Scaffold this motif. Structure first.
Motif, PDB file in Angstrom:
ATOM      1  N   UNK A 178      10.174 -17.837 -43.414  1.00  0.00           N
ATOM      2  CA  UNK A 178      11.034 -19.297 -43.177  1.00  0.00           C
ATOM      3  C   UNK A 178      12.479 -18.864 -42.891  1.00  0.00           C
ATOM      4  N   UNK A 179      13.116 -17.790 -43.435  1.00  0.00           N
ATOM      5  CA  UNK A 179      14.583 -17.532 -43.285  1.00  0.00           C
ATOM      6  C   UNK A 179      14.367 -16.678 -41.974  1.00  0.00           C
ATOM      7  N   UNK A 236      21.173 -17.748 -52.381  1.00  0.00           N
ATOM      8  CA  UNK A 236      20.543 -18.582 -51.823  1.00  0.00           C
ATOM      9  C   UNK A 236      21.581 -19.265 -50.691  1.00  0.00           C
ATOM     10  N   UNK A 237      22.817 -19.200 -50.815  1.00  0.00           N
ATOM     11  CA  UNK A 237      23.841 -19.530 -49.872  1.00  0.00           C
ATOM     12  C   UNK A 237      23.588 -18.749 -48.474  1.00  0.00           C
ATOM     13  N   UNK A 264      10.700 -22.795 -52.722  1.00  0.00           N
ATOM     14  CA  UNK A 264      10.947 -23.512 -51.752  1.00  0.00           C
ATOM     15  C   UNK A 264      11.707 -24.901 -52.280  1.00  0.00           C
ATOM     16  N   UNK A 265      11.697 -25.476 -53.203  1.00  0.00           N
ATOM     17  CA  UNK A 265      12.058 -26.786 -53.660  1.00  0.00           C
ATOM     18  C   UNK A 265      13.956 -26.371 -53.902  1.00  0.00           C
ATOM     19  N   UNK A 266      14.230 -25.106 -54.499  1.00  0.00           N
ATOM     20  CA  UNK A 266      15.651 -24.910 -54.877  1.00  0.00           C
ATOM     21  C   UNK A 266      16.174 -24.482 -53.354  1.00  0.00           C
ATOM     22  N   UNK A 272      24.884 -26.701 -49.876  1.00  0.00           N
ATOM     23  CA  UNK A 272      25.571 -26.169 -48.891  1.00  0.00           C
ATOM     24  C   UNK A 272      26.544 -26.922 -48.169  1.00  0.00           C
ATOM     25  N   UNK A 273      26.329 -27.935 -48.265  1.00  0.00           N
ATOM     26  CA  UNK A 273      27.481 -29.062 -47.494  1.00  0.00           C
ATOM     27  C   UNK A 273      28.659 -28.749 -48.261  1.00  0.00           C
ATOM     28  N   UNK A 274      28.590 -28.804 -49.511  1.00  0.00           N
ATOM     29  CA  UNK A 274      29.843 -28.783 -50.455  1.00  0.00           C
ATOM     30  C   UNK A 274      30.009 -27.223 -51.012  1.00  0.00           C
ATOM     31  N   UNK A 275      29.431 -26.351 -50.263  1.00  0.00           N
ATOM     32  CA  UNK A 275      29.843 -25.035 -50.419  1.00  0.00           C
ATOM     33  C   UNK A 275      31.108 -24.575 -49.879  1.00  0.00           C
ATOM     34  N   UNK A 276      31.969 -24.041 -50.550  1.00  0.00           N
ATOM     35  CA  UNK A 276      33.252 -23.874 -49.765  1.00  0.00           C
ATOM     36  C   UNK A 276      33.411 -22.881 -48.737  1.00  0.00           C
TER      37      UNK A 276
END
Ligand SMILES: Nc1ncnc2c1ncn2[C@H]1C[C@H](O)[C@@H](COP(=O)(O)OP(=O)(O)OP(=O)(O)O)O1
Ligand SMILES: [Mg+2]
Ligand SMILES: [Mg+2]
Ligand SMILES: [Mn+2]
Length: 758
Positions: free
Chosen positions: A336-337, A349-350, A486-488, A496-500
């Motif tokens: 998948x990645x 996971x980032x 897969x849910x996580x 990720x949107x809010x991951x600095x």
DNA sequence: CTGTGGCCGTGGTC
DNA sequence: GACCACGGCCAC
């Protein structure tokens, strides 16, 4: 089936190597045509003349721009012109990139920190681990001579055990009359024998439990001390010790070194992570543990070595079996990645999200944004509003339905098209306006990340189906793990949107998703309570426990299903509220902390001490029996009896030391502790005794009798001797057991004084 | 070190 | 005593 890529250098020029297993045959494919590059954005294309003349000197050789070409791409959906700068060697990119970026005419440079071998996987569209190709696997483990306070690898390896589908054997250099042991003359011979087993079995996968940090480093050390080449790679090479922050990782070229620990630590929630503990949790059965002193005692005397050899042989067999069970999950993630199994099984996971995004971006011709510099970091420190948690109705409630949104945050992102390339975009024709925060999202075209989450949700749904149909409990749990993973992963796209440190960072996106989450859950609560007669007892983010006061079980169920048929058609897109569970009795201690019991008598516990690694077993055990006595028997006076018997047992020192132990992780370097609690205190005193402590070390301690700071009374677990000094019965009653149970029995009018021993 | 919301024990200020 | 950051882990 592609396993991995790397590159080597031949004649100063990069050569890519593709490691493949095709039709049962291991191949190395060579590609010499691939050119390292990055992109530069210019004030004006006339400056390319000067930019091309930038050089750097690396190791006394001048580095130059091999070739420049102007390309058309997209950046957050918008057209953009950049110059693709090619080079002669990958190491040219770090050597020159800062000096290209410092050129006055260069606004910015892009995609300048993608490893060359992974750049190749992405750019060539290659997905590791695709195909029916069958891989062979071999696990190993070691047993070593150990004495407290000696340097790493001082003592010899005593045994090297290994296991695959067919056998499970121990190589040692002392005489053990067992049928799976192979006795050889020397440690050196034992190792050289292990080396040949691997070369001849030729495994694709090498499975260890913490091999990244213990087994391979020990073997390397012994090989240096005995003068052995530690030849495991399929190309003849020794294992390559990569670095990964505070830990290490070990490659074995041409094979997949599958180290189970990172995956297990990521998937299973245990107080400690011994191999016995992990085996017990996955397979149900116990594993006997023989200890370093037992091992050493047996070795220096000759007697009792068969218990050690059995222990060694089980380590390999169990490691192999854990390896077999979890490998399918890591393979699918690898696919998948689009990165190697070796990477994804150790990746945060980032970085998994980042690597997935980089690949899809290449297919879409989307220039990737850069990781932020230190200044952009500092302007991203602001927080934002999360999920709505309702303070629970407290007390004991009957006939509780649980209703919960499917894949809520991912579903919002997809339905409302929440992406940085659609935020306040152009002059668009239709948008969706996030509530409270106001951000507008264009709906004319699909956003980057919104266009990709769907398939992740399908993949999960597909595994979930397989899971709910599977009857074999072991295969059902492993399938639970995969669908949770897969849910996580999918939820990590929201986070990720809010991951600095994120490339496609977008705080407005992140907070728009949560705000929609809040609006939907609050709309469901209001529709339930003001129009369908339910009482919502508890609610968190996107799920809620509810009942109809005074109604029978079948009425609550029927009215709940009726509500869903009413509400789900009014929901947009993928928003869907699911019937998730029914409970005959439940009670809610506080936010995040409750317990409920289903129709078959299965108690589900959330948040309470029962489920935490850092409370003693005696507190957790008592709370569990209290919970059972209330939820399954409705017999609260028995719950009380239970507590008073356990408090009387602690007072008389009749509870064993093992239930008194507390497990707490060191999360950071000891020097960086602004406050020093008990576990830190114990840690620092081991660190003072020359005992390696690093982030992830789990400290196990008991508090002894005395007063003052608790960290002053606390000792390592292995070091408690009940004859020499007694444990703090007072501590375990008033600080462990009673706070755990009184937060429950409070609701029935019991005070602490009612639970103690006189 | 994917995000925020939250409980709770410990021990540092007065 | 009150106050209250710090740290660890859990529910989403
Ligand atoms: N580990 C996490 N990382 C980021 N956000 C999370 C995480 N866990 C939960 N959330 C957020 C996103 C979820 O949509 C939301 C509600 O959680 P939850 O119900 O457990 O998952 P879900 O709704 O995505 O899946 P499910 O279909 O199982 O209910 O909270
Ligand atoms: Mg759900
Ligand atoms: Mg939920
Ligand atoms: Mn949900």
């Amino acid at each position: 089936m592609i396993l991995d890529t790397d590159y080597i250098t031949e004649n100063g020029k990069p050569v890519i190597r593709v490691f493949k297993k095709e039709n049962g045959e291991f191949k190395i494919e060579y590609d010499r045509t691939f050119e390292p590059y990055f992109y530069a954005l210019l004030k004006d294309d006339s400056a390319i003349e000067d930019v091309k003349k930038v050089t750097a000197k690396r190791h006394g050789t001048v580095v130059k721009v091999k070739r420049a070409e102007k390309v058309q791409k997209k950046f957050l959906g918008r057209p953009i012109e950049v110059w693709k700068l090619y080079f002669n060697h990958p190491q040219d990119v770090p050597a020159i990139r800062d000096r290209i970026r410092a050129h006055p005419a260069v606004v910015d440079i892009y995609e300048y920190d993608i490893p060359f071998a992974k750049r190749y996987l992405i750019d060539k569209g290659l997905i590791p681990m695709e195909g029916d190709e069958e891989l062979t696997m071999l696990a190993f483990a070691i047993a070593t001579l150990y004495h407290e306070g000696e340097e790493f690898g001082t003592g010899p390896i005593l045994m090297i055990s290994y296991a695959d589908g067919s056998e499970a054997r121990v190589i040692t250099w002392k005489k053990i009359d067992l049928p799976y042991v192979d006795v050889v003359s020397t440690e050196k011979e034992m190792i050289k024998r292990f080396l040949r087993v691997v070369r001849e079995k030729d495994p694709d996968v090498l499975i260890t439990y913490n091999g990244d940090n213990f087994d391979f480093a020990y073997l390397k050390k012994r090989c240096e001390e005995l003068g052995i080449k530690f030849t495991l790679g399929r190309d003849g090479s020794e294992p390559k010790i990569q670095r990964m922050g505070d830990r290490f990782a070990v490659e074995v070229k041409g094979r997949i070194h599958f180290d189970l620990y990172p995956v297990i630590r990521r998937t299973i929630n245990l107080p400690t992570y011994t191999l016995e503990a992990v085996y017990e949790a996955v397979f149900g059965k116990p594993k006997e543990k023989v200890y370093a002193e037992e091992i050493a005692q047996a070795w220096e005397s000759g007697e009792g070595l068969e218990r050690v050899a059995r222990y060694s042989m089980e380590d390999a067999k169990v490691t192999y079996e854990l390896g077999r069970e979890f490998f399918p999950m890591e393979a699918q993630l690898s696919r998948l990645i689009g990165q190697s199994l070796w990477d994804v099984s150790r990746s945060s996971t980032g970085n998994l999200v980042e690597w997935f995004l980089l690949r899809k971006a290449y297919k879409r011709n989307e220039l990737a944004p850069n990781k932020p510099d230190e200044r952009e970091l500092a302007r991203r420190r602001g927080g934002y509003a999360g999920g709505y948690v309702k303070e629970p109705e407290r007390g004991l409630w009957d006939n509780i339905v649980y209703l919960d949104f499917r894949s809520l945050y991912p579903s919002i992102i997809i339905t409302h098209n929440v992406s940085p390339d659609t935020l306040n975009r152009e002059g668009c024709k239709e948008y969706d306006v996030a509530p409270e925060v106001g951000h507008k999202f264009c709906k004319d075209f699909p956003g980057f990340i919104p266009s990709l989450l769907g398939d992740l949700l399908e993949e999960r749904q597909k595994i979930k189906r397989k899971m709910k149909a599977t009857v074999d409990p072991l295969e059902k749990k492993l399938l639970d793990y995969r669908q949770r993973a897969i849910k996580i992963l999918a939820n990590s796209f929201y986070g990720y949107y809010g991951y600095a440190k994120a490339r496609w960072y977008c705080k407005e996106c992140a907070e728009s998703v949560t705000a929609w989450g809040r609006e939907y859950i609050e709309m469901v609560i209001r529709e339930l309570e003001e129009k369908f007669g339910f009482k919502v007892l508890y609610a968190d983010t996107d799920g809620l426990h509810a009942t109809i006061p005074g109604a029978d079980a079948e009425t609550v169920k029927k009215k709940a299903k009726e509500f869903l048929k009413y509400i789900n058609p009014k929901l947009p897109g993928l928003l869907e509220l699911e019937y998730e569970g029914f409970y005959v009795r439940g009670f809610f201690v506080t936010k995040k902390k409750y317990a409920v019991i289903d129709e078959e008598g299965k108690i589900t516990t959330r948040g309470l001490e029962i489920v935490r690694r850092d409370w003693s077993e005696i507190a957790k055990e008592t709370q569990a029996r209290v919970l059972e006595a209330i939820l399954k028997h409705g017999d609260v006076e028995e719950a009380v009896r239970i507590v008073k018997e356990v408090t009387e047992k602690l007072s008389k020192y009749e509870v064993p030391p093992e239930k008194l132990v507390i497990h707490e992780q060191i999360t950071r370097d000891l020097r960086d502790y602004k406050a020093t609690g008990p576990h830190v205190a114990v840690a620092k005193r081991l660190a003072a005794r020359g005992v390696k402590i690093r982030p992830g070390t789990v400290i196990s301690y008991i508090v002894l009798k005395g007063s003052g700071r608790i960290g002053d009374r606390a000792i390592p677990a292995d070091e408690f001797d009940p004859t020499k000094h007694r444990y703090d019965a007072e501590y375990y009653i008033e600080n462990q057991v009673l706070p755990a149970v009184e937060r429950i029995l409070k609701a029935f009018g019991y005070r602490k004084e009612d639970l103690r021993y006189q």
